Symmetry: C2
Amino acid sequence: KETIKINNIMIAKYTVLYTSNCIMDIYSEEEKITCFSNRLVFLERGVNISVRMQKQILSEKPYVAFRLNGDMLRHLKDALMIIYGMSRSMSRKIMTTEVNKTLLDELKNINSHDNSAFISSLIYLISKLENNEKIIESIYISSVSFFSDKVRNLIEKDLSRKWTLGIIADAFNASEITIRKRLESENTNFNQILMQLRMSKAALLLLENSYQISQISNMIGISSASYFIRIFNKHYGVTPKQFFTYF
Amino acid sequence: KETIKINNIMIAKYTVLYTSNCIMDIYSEEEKITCFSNRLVFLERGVNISVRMQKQILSEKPYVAFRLNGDMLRHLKDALMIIYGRSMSRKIMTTEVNKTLLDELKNINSHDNSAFISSLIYLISKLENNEKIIESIYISSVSFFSDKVRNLIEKDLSRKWTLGIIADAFNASEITIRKRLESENTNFNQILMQLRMSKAALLLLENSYQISQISNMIGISSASYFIRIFNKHYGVTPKQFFTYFK
């Protein structure tokens, strides 16, 4: 059909999504946010969400996404801390707004080149928005580094290794218990971090259409291909085929 | 007529001007830059220029100006230093304004400094060879010696300032103050004259004050003296200046 329900979607980069040809019911932090067609969604870095999407036009893609790397996010952060002044609910983590045709011109003039101009245009849009304070807080709070972030960096160094909690401890020159606490404070466990890393990398590589499922599996650190397919299903709720075909 | 030539116009705030209904021949540093109608001009802080303006429609104002205070300029500077990392040609720069950029030029407001600095960012991003403009903003964000003297004199434009006073204030010698000022091609008397004549021009255009009031405000004893000095400095009578700018 034109309808999908994907689970455990992790936002790893500050994301600005334009619903375009899809209606999205987002479930996160035991809350529900419905994004209508022709809206802009602001997903902050780190929210684990689930989505129920209904495509309007089937032949085309669902939505239009804009993800911000660390450098761009930090620069936007500092710019917003100069422009609008220096400085825990889903309502302030996933925020939807209505986009004007004038803003639509910029939404078509967005380009992955001229990153200077891209950050400028984000500044401009944020300026042209009612109640932008919410959005602004997200951009800044999504710039801080947590345990989940340092652990994720260390694990991203070699996703194929047989990581354990002892390894993490040795690397951080601390004890297993202490690492367990830096994680538990942020409602995560080492196994969850590792599983999200691998399934997110796998989803991206899958959509790249440049790699076999065996290649994807060996890349993220999974031994067999059948095993990988079963885990992808158990995590997202769909087979890599269903996921790929939907987009 | 609809044509005026004003001398010794000093830009005290980074200025973005929309020529609108005027043709401007700007003369400075033995150079000539002609801004055509329906253009945007970027004049950096500090350029002493002379202008020949030609109005297309007489009843209206010549141009539409946008001046940046120190704090706003500094904030724009910092934003531009996060985003992007000697000749008049790189101090006075003119460009053609697009309907989109013009629409933003109308969506300006002197209250939401955040929105204005953002709009400057947006426009600057949409510009060919914007590096020139950006350099102007950053060099016009620098604090020179002449600016410190200017602020000190600004504290009380009516006082009979002398070079001894300025020297004592900076805890240095007269020679040193004179030469540090001369390094930026200025003298204490020029700083004071520019301060008073600029404040006078603004007050005059405010249409809320008489020439006697203007005179006493900038620190000048008689009104006749003020008018003669205004004419000698800018080249026009306060009447001519005012009537030209409606």
